[PDB]
Amino acid sequence: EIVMTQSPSSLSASVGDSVTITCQASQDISNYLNWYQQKPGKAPKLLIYDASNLETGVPSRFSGGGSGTDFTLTITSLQPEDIATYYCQQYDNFPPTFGPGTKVDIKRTVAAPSVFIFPPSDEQLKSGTASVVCLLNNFYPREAKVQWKVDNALQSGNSQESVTEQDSADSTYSLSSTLTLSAADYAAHAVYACEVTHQGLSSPVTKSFNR
């Protein structure tokens, strides 16, 4: 079975740059080679078929080339909405096989996060658990640090965090952190704070509440 390789594994570029990704077959596949675009959570989408034919409705800034064992896909004016993983796929011999994919990310101006904090709901409190949630919205680059502080004392070991994929419109990220305590423990302290550091901020930002 034909092994399909792709390089680079990922790349970063800015809006308007021209980007070229490559695909190699282990042996000759003529031009029996297709390209798919996929964004996280979504199904793949066919972009180029037979190495160089645009599927109907694909923007003209996409183009593909090659024949035999080496193939390329090229985007000429990278747009925010071109953020995705791109897969190549051969159909010359059975069974058809896919490459491992190349991830295209986008650079943009530094943007500091907006920071919000949510106390636990009473619906959850009566069940005996208290989750406190800190939201970092629409920032860039993706590197950011959140620290939880209870009565001004830093915490460890009771929080979890998760960052979104890059936004296809404004090229930013968001981040959600949750601090989970027992109702007993939660009710023994006063002030709850998340402290946020990010290259867009010269000093760490703190959002807090009492109770």
Partner 1 sequence: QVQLVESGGGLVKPGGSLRLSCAASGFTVGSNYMSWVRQAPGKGLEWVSVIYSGGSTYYADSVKGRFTISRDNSKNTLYLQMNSLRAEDTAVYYCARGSSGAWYFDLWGRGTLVTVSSASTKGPSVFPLAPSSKSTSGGTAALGCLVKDYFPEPVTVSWNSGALTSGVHTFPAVLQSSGLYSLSSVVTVPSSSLGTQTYICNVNHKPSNTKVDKKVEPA
Distance separating alpha carbons of residues 41 and 45, to the nearest angstrom: 12
Q: Are 165 and 158 in contact (CB under 8 A)?
A: no
Query: Does 168 sit near partner 1 (CB under 8 A)?
Result: no
Query: Does 91 sit near partner 1 (CB under 8 A)?
Result: yes
Residue 73's beta-bridge partner residues? 21, 64
Query: Does 67 sit near partner 1 (CB under 8 A)?
Result: no
- Could you tell me which of 83, 97, 74, 101 has the C-alpha nearest to residue 18? 74
Least distance (Å) between residue 17 CB and partner 1: 26
Contacts of residue 158, defined as CB under 8 A and 6 or more positions apart, other chains included, come to 148, 179, 180, 181
Give the helix ranges, DSSP H, for the chain: 122-125, 183-186
Among 60, 160, 202, 203, binds partner 1 (CB under 8 A): 160
Site string for partner 1, 95-134 (x = CB under 8 A): xxxxxxx------------xxxxxxxx-xx--x---x-x-
Query: Does 20 sit near partner 1 (CB under 8 A)?
Result: no
Per-residue tokens: 46: 């066919």
Least distance (Å) between residue 133 CB and partner 1: 6
- Alpha-carbon distances of 8 from 95, 100, 103, 119, rounded to whole Å: 25, 10, 8, 43
Among 36, 71, 86, 140, binds partner 1 (CB under 8 A): 36
Site for partner 1 in 134-153 (CB under 8 A): 135, 137
Query: Does 89 sit near partner 1 (CB under 8 A)?
Result: yes
Residue type, 145: K
List residues binding partner 1 (CB under 8 A): 32, 34, 36, 43-46, 49, 55, 87, 89, 91, 94-101, 114-121, 123-124, 127, 131, 133, 135, 137, 160-164, 174, 176, 178, 180, 207-209
